[PDB]
Amino acid sequence: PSRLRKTRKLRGHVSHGHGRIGKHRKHPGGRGNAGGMHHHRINFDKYHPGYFGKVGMRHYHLKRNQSFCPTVNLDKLWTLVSEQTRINAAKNKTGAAPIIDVVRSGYYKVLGKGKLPKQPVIVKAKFFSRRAEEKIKGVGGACVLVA
Amino acid sequence: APSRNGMILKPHFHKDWQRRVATWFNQPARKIRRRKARQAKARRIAPRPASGPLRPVVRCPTVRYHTKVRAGRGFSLEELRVAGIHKKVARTIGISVDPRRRNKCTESLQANVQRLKEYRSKLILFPRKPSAPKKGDSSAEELKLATQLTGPVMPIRNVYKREKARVITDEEKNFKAFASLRMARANARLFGIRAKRAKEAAEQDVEKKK
RNA sequence: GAUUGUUCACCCACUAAUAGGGAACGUGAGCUGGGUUUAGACCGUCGUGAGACAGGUUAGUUUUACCCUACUGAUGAUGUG
RNA sequence: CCUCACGAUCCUUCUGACCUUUUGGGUUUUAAGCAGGAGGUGUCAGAAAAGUUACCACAGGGAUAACUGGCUUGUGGCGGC
RNA sequence: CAUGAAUGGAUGAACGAGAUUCCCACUGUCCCUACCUACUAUCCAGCGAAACCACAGCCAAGGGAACGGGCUUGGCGGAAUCAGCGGGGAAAGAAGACCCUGUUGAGCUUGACUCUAGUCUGGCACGGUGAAGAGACAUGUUUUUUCACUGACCCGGUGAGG
RNA sequence: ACAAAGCAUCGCGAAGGCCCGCGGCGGGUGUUGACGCGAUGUGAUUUCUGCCCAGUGCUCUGAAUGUCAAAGUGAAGAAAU
RNA sequence: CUGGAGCGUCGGGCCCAUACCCGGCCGUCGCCGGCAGUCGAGAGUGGACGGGAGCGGCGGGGGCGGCGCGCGCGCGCGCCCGCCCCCGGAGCCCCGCGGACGCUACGCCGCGACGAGUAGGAGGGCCGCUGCGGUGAGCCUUGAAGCCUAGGGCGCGGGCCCGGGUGGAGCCGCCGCAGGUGCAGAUCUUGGUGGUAGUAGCAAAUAUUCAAACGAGAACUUUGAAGGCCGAAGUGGAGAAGGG
RNA sequence: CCCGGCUCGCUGGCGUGAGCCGGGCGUGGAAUGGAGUGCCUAGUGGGCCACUUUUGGUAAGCAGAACUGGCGCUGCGGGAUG
RNA sequence: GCGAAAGACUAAUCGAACCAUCUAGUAGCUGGUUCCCUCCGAAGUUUCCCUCAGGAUAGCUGGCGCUCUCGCACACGCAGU
RNA sequence: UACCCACCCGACCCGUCUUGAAACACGGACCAAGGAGUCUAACACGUGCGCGAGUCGGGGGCUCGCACGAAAGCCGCCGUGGCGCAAUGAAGGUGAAGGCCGGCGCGCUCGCCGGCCGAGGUGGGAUCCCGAGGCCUCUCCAGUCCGCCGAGGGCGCACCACCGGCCCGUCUCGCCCGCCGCGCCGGGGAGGUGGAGCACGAGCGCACGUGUUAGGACCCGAAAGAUGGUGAACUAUGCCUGGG
RNA sequence: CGCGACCUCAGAUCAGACGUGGCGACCCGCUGAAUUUAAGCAUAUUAGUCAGCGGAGGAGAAGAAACUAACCAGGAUUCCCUCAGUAACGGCGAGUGAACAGGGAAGAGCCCAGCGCCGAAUCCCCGCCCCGCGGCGGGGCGCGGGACAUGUGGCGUACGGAAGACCCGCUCCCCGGCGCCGCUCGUGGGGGGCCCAAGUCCUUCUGAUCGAGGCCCAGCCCGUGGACGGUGUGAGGCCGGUAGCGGCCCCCGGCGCGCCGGGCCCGGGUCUUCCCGGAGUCGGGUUGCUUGGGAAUGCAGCCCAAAGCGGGUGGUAAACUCCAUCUAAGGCUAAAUACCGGCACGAGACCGAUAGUCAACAAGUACCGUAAGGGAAAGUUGAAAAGAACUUUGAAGAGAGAGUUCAAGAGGGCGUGAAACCGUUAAGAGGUAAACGGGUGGGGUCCGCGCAGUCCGCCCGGAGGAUUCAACCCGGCGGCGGGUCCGGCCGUGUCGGCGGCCCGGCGGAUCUUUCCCGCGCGGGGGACCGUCCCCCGACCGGCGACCGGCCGCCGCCGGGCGCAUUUCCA
Ligand SMILES: [Mg+2]
Ligand SMILES: [Mg+2]
Ligand SMILES: [Mg+2]
Ligand SMILES: [Mg+2]
Ligand SMILES: [Mg+2]
Ligand SMILES: [Mg+2]
Ligand SMILES: [Mg+2]
Ligand SMILES: [Mg+2]
Ligand SMILES: [Mg+2]
Ligand SMILES: [Mg+2]
Ligand SMILES: [Mg+2]
Ligand SMILES: [Mg+2]
Ligand SMILES: [Mg+2]
Ligand SMILES: [Mg+2]
Ligand SMILES: [Mg+2]
Ligand SMILES: [Mg+2]
Ligand SMILES: [Mg+2]
Ligand SMILES: [Mg+2]
Ligand SMILES: [Mg+2]
Ligand SMILES: [Mg+2]
Ligand SMILES: [Mg+2]
Ligand SMILES: [Mg+2]
Ligand SMILES: [Mg+2]
Ligand SMILES: [Mg+2]
Ligand SMILES: [Mg+2]
Ligand SMILES: [Mg+2]
Ligand SMILES: [Mg+2]
Ligand SMILES: [Mg+2]
Ligand SMILES: [Mg+2]
Ligand SMILES: [Mg+2]
Ligand SMILES: [Mg+2]
Ligand SMILES: [Mg+2]
Ligand SMILES: [Mg+2]
Ligand SMILES: [Mg+2]
Ligand SMILES: [Mg+2]
Ligand SMILES: [Mg+2]
Ligand SMILES: [Mg+2]
Ligand SMILES: [Mg+2]
Ligand SMILES: [Mg+2]
Ligand SMILES: [Mg+2]
Ligand SMILES: [Mg+2]
Ligand SMILES: [Mg+2]
Ligand SMILES: [Mg+2]
Ligand SMILES: [Mg+2]
Ligand SMILES: [Mg+2]
Ligand SMILES: [Mg+2]
Ligand SMILES: [Mg+2]
Ligand SMILES: [Mg+2]
Ligand SMILES: [Mg+2]
Ligand SMILES: [Mg+2]
Ligand SMILES: [Mg+2]
Ligand SMILES: [Mg+2]
Ligand SMILES: [Mg+2]
Ligand SMILES: [Mg+2]
Ligand SMILES: [Mg+2]
Ligand SMILES: [Mg+2]
Ligand SMILES: [Mg+2]
Ligand SMILES: [Mg+2]
Ligand SMILES: [Mg+2]
Ligand SMILES: [Mg+2]
Ligand SMILES: [Mg+2]
Ligand SMILES: [Mg+2]
Ligand SMILES: [Mg+2]
Ligand SMILES: [Mg+2]
Ligand SMILES: [Mg+2]
């Protein structure tokens, strides 16, 4: 609101928080992101390094749907499925191992972060990591692919 | 004139946003303009599914989106000769006909056929005249209803089937699922080059012979 | 006084002397406007040219005081019944 | 023998890897990357650039001149030992 | 320094509100001023405006944005005014016309950079008919030189008259 | 100063000079024809008009072995080439 | 101004700043501040509760002393034994049984310390303007806003509050929310008003005078008379365009 | 500081050297005052003057540095005025 | 456009009219910028700049903060010494 | 305190640009009224509130002639997605996990197999816990309760410094390979370095302050440029028709 | 040297139609800058924007793929969210800068040409009648015209269609009238007209009340009505109105039965024969503009210019080569969708007459410029003109009385009525221009007082005078506090009941299709865990959550107590 502004406290205050030596003139520097090479250089070079120039390779027309691929970490599969499906098993005595469609919860790829609880699993996913492989194997249980 | 850490910002107001600004103080009166259509259309077509005709189960395209399903435009043609519904009749019976779908699989064909088979069965064909003959459903199955279907006819919900826990045979537990991806992605990589060498090596067996 | 826009000079002449200076380089609502120094023009030179030239030359609008002051005069003024 | 003796982006070329992309697949050209070198900005942190205006204009400027004034006194003039 | 031949050179009768110079006559141009008249100003009746103004308005010197009205010390000051006057208020008029700078212009110029209308030439297109004849390649193709023709195309005249 | 009359060059025989227009088979000179039209230069009369084609222009039935696009034709290739 | 009010070197004595001291008062910062109901002033514990006993004790340093002592333990009373008793009452400087008047817990209180300011920041504004949601059994024809006041006051001050008159219709206080929000300035915009000032000025064509009329009123109108001018290339007599 | 012990692919006749574990040991010249560290960020980026040092200049109220001190930015007694 | 030629004139306008719109044109440049009190409180210094009337970043400032110490008989640190 | 007056001391006219203004710099006769940091988008930090590995917001829907309403309520919407929940590589793509123990492979600081523990350590680290010893308590001893002091020792967040580790890129080096297939296939090591990485999380939504831009842009303030139109009533020329 | 068909082409004030201007927000073609931006600058941007120009309608355009895609696929348009400020473009810089997928609003599809089939099955214009006539139409009847064989009708159009054979089942739409029946959502469709509660009750203010108390429940009445405006001040009640499936009367709208006149023999499914795409078009070369499209996204001119298992596309040129996906060269269309112009309304954190639009009024008015164009100022008496009759002074303007008014110190530019500014009355001052700061002093106007300001408040002592008590009990009532948690009710933590569990639900990708219903899936039921309820029993916080008794204390009321008490007064 208007009421809670400095401009209220700057009346009778001649130059208006803006200096009477060098006034508030219109557009001293330039207009917007202007003088990046020349003379505003010191910002752009010290504060946004790697702005000026090309790099890399075009992929031109590009569509993200083509390369949609979310990630999950082992870390939290023992979320995706209702926690009761874990409490059931860890127990049960038959080596059930519940199935986890990392598909069905919304992730085109599973990755090996974190601990995994000592508990056999069947993870059906798309693009598994290596480490995700190893951890699941080394716990017990398996890595099934989906198309 | 930037000062000490921000972003760059290419705000695009160098043109003339000012003239062509649409504010939206229609929004709520529009909400209501709309209400009165939804409303009126229903009272006009009294017994008829308010939402609109029956529309097919259909799979979303691009790779990310795969696992979803939709109300499609309309049921295919191939689909109908199968359900035994004439395409020009369907259009009068509140059955939505796209006639522009390449049907590729028996899975999504019969899935989508079952919707028509379902529809027939729970459809009260309200007869041409009052004193009318065949195919119109009887004065009992007629009195019972005046019922507009509020909401989308036979709504398409993305439903999955649970897989019970298993035993994990020592065979699922051997498959190195990472390795086999890398294999896959290299055989698909080089399938073509590899084929040029069979084509050259088959050339050398004839070129050594001559 | 002759010359000279001239300051500056030089000469004739007189005398007693023909000293030197200042006052916003005393003094444009005092003048004049001769020279500078607009716009028009002309020759010299330079410039390829537009054009340049303390290189010459001729024509080129010179405001306003009634206001306070100073001054010059003019009435007057409180005081002395 | 030490202290100078050279140079971004974008652009161009040459080289390097059985490199990556060239995209609905595949093979060859071709093109784009990636990583090193060269072309070069002499205003050297890097504008692709001739004049004139006394026919002139606007923002400004006592931060920039031409008078007046201050200081200074080289020079000038004047005067001592 | 630094003229000069149609960037014309040299002359010159007449003419020039064109620039100089000298002489006679004349003359309040001057010595050096003087007087007279008309209209004013002036005074009155009537009618009555403007420009400008921070506050204002006597001076010396000091200092002081290095020439102040203010202030310091001095000098001093009697109400309200009239005609004059141009010494002062760097008076007014009029964000200096002189000069510098601006990545502010305009007008003009050319050997500036970048372009343009226009024109010259080549190609392609409407864009054909016939005729000769030649070379080049090859052992038909191409290049086509030249000369006609009139159907497009073009120009000529009339009231489309042989 | 300009013009001026006088002197002087220069292009032009109309599918033209010069010229306009945005465009047409558009228009002015032109109700014209070189004693005319267009383009310049100097500036009455008298006397004269000196040398220089080394620059830049202009121009010339001039060689264009200098180069030079498009298209055109030649070739390799599998095609962009 | 002159054995000086001159100049050297020196005394005492005195004079004065927003400087220092003490005090007064108003700011701010800090105090690991106190103060949301409690003992206690270089604080150096307090309390059960037992067994045993009593004038014991804790029979330690010119330390000058700090940690132990001379207002009591035990005692007066009930009579060697009991007690050593209850604040709804000890009578209270300590009170722990319950707590300011004070405690808007962003209130109030004591210490100290400190408070030159352009640009700028920041904070604080029961400083100010207009709008709305709340709220003030707000105010008001028994007189609102504005306006006016050499009417009493208050704040440091933005302003605020009170005294009267006039005015004639509406207005304000708090808690919130909302602004086109507070002027001396911009050769700022518009409207008004001064000084100048009763000032400049009513100067181009030689020219008026008398009498009467009319009239409230006559230099200015009209009539007469007289003097004058334009002076037929006109101030004479008719037209165009324009004017209407 | 001082003891004990381990590790090494470096270094070397052995040790060094470095790294670690484990133990042993306190006010280390004066004076002053509570220390540490992270964001946002305005104005500013024409300055001027003095002692002393000092460069141009002859000299300047001239031009340009050092060092410090002022004014700007901030009055007051004094410095008659500034 | 028109100029016997002088940048003459195009309806008080000419180195090239007036009217409306684009139009809040742009401006490193003039001017101004509106209520109280309290506290802290500069710089005209750094490197790059088509930079010298301006910017860029060095500083200095405020605010916002936080980590802790302990003046609660029982402190380490820092420093124009 | 205010009005007039009186005195004594003080005393230059504000605003502004300015190294320096009373300026012999500029604005400013006086007065009323108007008048200049605004809105939006985007960032960024600071802060307020909701929920929290989520959280939202629309746009849509369902519920109104609105009086209040163009409100409020509600929706597997609620997530179709943004933001976050992971980076790194130009790209194909890979992707944050280590310790330990035993066993097996010659522990060859190489490979594999079973178990245990799970985000490695050091130094600082508010600091919570333990605490030897005091320090009283009417006597000598006994002793449970109760606090104060407390040398010394333990856990140690947050944060800071360091040492370790893991993902990706790139390099170097060098080992063993699996074998739906053949390796110009895929795969595994050691060391170093680049990374806006992981190493037991902090975002999301919504407020508000500040700031920075984009925006007319704090207001005022040009010489120009462009697009379209109107004019020869003046004058310049040409022509037509009149007059002297 | 004739007449006659046709083809081309004229003329008709021929018969009948129609086109042209305007409006112009929104709509469509094109054209088209420069300020501006880049700290210059031309590249770029402003920006395909303004002007210019052209064109439409109640909306405009587009639209039934030569699309999307790379999926396990979708499926006309437009719009909103979203992608996403992203892919790329750029002195790769200022800027620029889209798209594909999903969700949602809405959602409808269709028609030509050709190939062919069918005695042109067609079409147009006349004349006579029958109905119909305020959007000119049906019905019939006419050797009444004419187009059309260079081609008019039906089917048909690619999603297949035609034609055949036999497989199946069986017959209602359309239009011109002409009636009639149900007025057919704001909660009786549109419009108009007409209509529907309750005080001027008392008293009292006031010029006038609409104001203030009161008035059988905040008073009386009404209240599906208390919005608002009017009404000589603030009024639910006076009046218009308001509310109110309130009423009635016209008209208009739309939909339902009958009659009639006309039109129409219109299905569905199987096996075969054949039949197919729109040319100077695609494409290419080029140039020009555009976007973002790119070694060419779009559009252009010119040049070259196709094919039929082809063509386009399948987003860095190209050859080969493999795969996908449409089908151009013909065409229409609601709906959402846009709306600073119009008509007609509704509202506001708005402005409130130097603001608000230039304009509250003779506003696009007065006036200016020749003209394009420019373009103002200016609201208010009171409630009622009741707006000064009449006497008088004054030539008249003006006054003095008087009169009207609640008020003329509201007088026809009139509410209020500031400051500068000027008008005069009173006081005081006045040679250093005024004006200012500090300090006093004198005087005034006012303001407090005092005709003693002796300021109050306790307590006490004394002396006067007067009511009922206080202290005490007893009856009652009401508090408070205490506890026995005594008894009960309440809830916290624990335990027991496995008791709600099916008479307790909801959540969970938990589990069983041993179940049931409907089509392996969906719905339903049944098992499981996590959650939330009953029974009772036990412990404990026994909690502001009470409620009952017992207690202890306080207060009030009523009794007692008559006076060394306990009050009042001086
Ligand atoms: Mg300030
Ligand atoms: Mg300023
Ligand atoms: Mg729908
Ligand atoms: Mg002389
Ligand atoms: Mg002079
Ligand atoms: Mg003069
Ligand atoms: Mg003079
Ligand atoms: Mg002269
Ligand atoms: Mg001249
Ligand atoms: Mg000459
Ligand atoms: Mg020359
Ligand atoms: Mg050597
Ligand atoms: Mg490709
Ligand atoms: Mg391909
Ligand atoms: Mg000249
Ligand atoms: Mg100067
Ligand atoms: Mg100066
Ligand atoms: Mg001088
Ligand atoms: Mg002067
Ligand atoms: Mg510059
Ligand atoms: Mg220029
Ligand atoms: Mg050139
Ligand atoms: Mg010549
Ligand atoms: Mg010659
Ligand atoms: Mg020559
Ligand atoms: Mg201060
Ligand atoms: Mg407002
Ligand atoms: Mg104001
Ligand atoms: Mg005469
Ligand atoms: Mg006449
Ligand atoms: Mg500056
Ligand atoms: Mg200097
Ligand atoms: Mg000239
Ligand atoms: Mg300046
Ligand atoms: Mg001066
Ligand atoms: Mg100035
Ligand atoms: Mg995003
Ligand atoms: Mg320009
Ligand atoms: Mg039209
Ligand atoms: Mg600029
Ligand atoms: Mg620029
Ligand atoms: Mg420019
Ligand atoms: Mg451009
Ligand atoms: Mg563009
Ligand atoms: Mg663009
Ligand atoms: Mg336009
Ligand atoms: Mg689409
Ligand atoms: Mg009412
Ligand atoms: Mg009313
Ligand atoms: Mg009524
Ligand atoms: Mg095409
Ligand atoms: Mg473009
Ligand atoms: Mg089409
Ligand atoms: Mg269409
Ligand atoms: Mg349409
Ligand atoms: Mg007005
Ligand atoms: Mg107005
Ligand atoms: Mg008025
Ligand atoms: Mg008024
Ligand atoms: Mg009145
Ligand atoms: Mg009145
Ligand atoms: Mg009124
Ligand atoms: Mg009045
Ligand atoms: Mg007065
Ligand atoms: Mg008097």
Q: Is the dihedral of CA A76, A77, A80, A81 positive or negative?
A: negative
Residue with tokens 């001559």: B210
Cα(B66)–Cα(A104) distance, rounded to whole angstroms? Answer: 11
Q: Are B56 and B72 in contact (CB under 8 A)?
A: yes
Q: Distances in Å between the alpha carbon of B47 and those of B6, B43, B44, B59, B124? A: 61, 8, 9, 30, 10
Cβ proximity of B152 and B71 under 8 Å: yes
Resolution of this model in Å is: 3.8
B121's enclosing H/E stretch is: helix B106-121
Q: Is the dihedral of CA A30, A31, A35, A40 positive or negative?
A: positive
Asked whether A105 and A80 are in contact (CB, 8 A), the reply is yes
Residue with tokens 């716990």: A139
User: Are the C-beta atoms of B87 and B74 separated by less than 8 Å?
Assistant: no
CB neighbour list of residue A97: distance below 8 Å, 6 or more residues apart: A89, A119, A120, A121, A122, A140, A141, A142, B165, B166, B167, B168
Q: Do the strands B69-71 and B57-59 form a parallel or antiparallel pair, or are they unpaired?
A: antiparallel
**Phi and psi angles of residue B108, each rounded to the nearest 5 degrees, phi first:** -75, -15
B8, A33: Cβ pair inside 8 Å?
yes
Strand residue runs (E) in A37-147: 72-73, 99-101, 110-111, 121-125, 141-145
| Assigned token pair, A93 | 């005595």
What φ, ψ does residue B20 adopt, rounded to 5°?
Answer: -100, 70
Rounded Cα gap, residues B125 and B195, in angstroms: 62
Q: Which of B74, B146, B148 is nearest to B116 (CA)?
A: B74
Backbone angles phi, psi at B163, to 5 degrees: -105, 115
- Which residue, A28, A133, A126, A50, is CA-closest to B64? A126
Which nucleotide in the DNA or RNA is closest to residue A16, CA to C1'?
I33
A36 vs A56: CA distance, rounded Å: 22
d(CA A12, CA B154): 72
Distance (Å, whole) CA B138 – CA B148:
18
Beta strands, E only, A44-118: 72-73, 99-101, 110-111
Interface check for A129 against chain B (CB to CB < 8 A): the answer is: yes
B148, B42 Cβ separation under 8 angstroms? yes
Q: How big is the CA angle at A28 (ends A26 and A32), to the nearest 5 degrees?
A: 90
Can you name the residues that pair with A99 across neighbouring β-strands? A122
Read off φ and ψ for residue A141, nearest 5 degrees.
95, 175
**Residues whose C-beta lies under 7 Å from strand I:** A 8-16, 19-31, 35, 38-43, 46; B 1-4
Reduce the DSSP state of residue A92 to 3 states and report it: coil
Q: Give the angle subtended at the CA of B64 by the CAs of B59 and B65, to the nearest 5°.
A: 25
Asked if A33 lies within 8 A of B9 by C-beta distance, the reply is: yes
Buried b (16+ CB within 10 A) or exposed e, B144-158: eeeeebeeebbebee
Please name the amino acid found at residue A102.
V
AA letter at B104:
K
Output B28-32 pairs: Cβ under 8 A, ≥24 positions apart. Answer: none
Nearest CA in chain B to A107: B64
CA distance A132 to A91: 24
Sheet of A121-125: strands edge to edge?
A99-101, A121-125, A141-145
The technique by which this structure was obtained is: cryo-EM
State the DSSP code for A75.
Answer: G
Please state, in angstroms and as integers, the Cα–Cα distance from residue A135 to each residue in A7, A103, B175, following that order: 62, 19, 14
- Both structure tokens of A109: 């790829």
* Inter-residue contact A30 to A43 (CB < 8 Å): no
**B5: chain A residues, CB-CB within 8 Å:** 47
Helix, strand, coil tally for chain B in percent (to 5): 40, 5, 60
As a whole number of angstroms, the distance between CA A68 and CA A78 comes to 24
Alpha helices in A6-56 (DSSP H): 6-9, 41-47
3-state DSSP call for residue B180?
A: helix
Token pair, residue B95, equals 């059955």
Q: What whole-number distance in Å separates Cα of residue B37 and Cα of residue B101?
A: 31
Euclidean distance between CA atoms B170 and A100, whole angstroms: 19
Identify whether the C-beta of residue A115 lies closer than 8 Å to the C-beta of residue A94.
no
DSSP assignments along B9-50, one per residue:
-----SS-TTTT----TTHHHHHHHHHHHHHHHHHHT-SS-T
Burial of B77 (0-12, 13-18, 19+ CB in 10 A): middle
Report residue A59: phi and psi, to 5°.
-145, 70
Q: Which of B5, B64, B163 lies nearest to residue A108, judging by beta carbons?
A: B64
Question: Closest by alpha carbon to A145, among A135, A75, A132?
Answer: A132
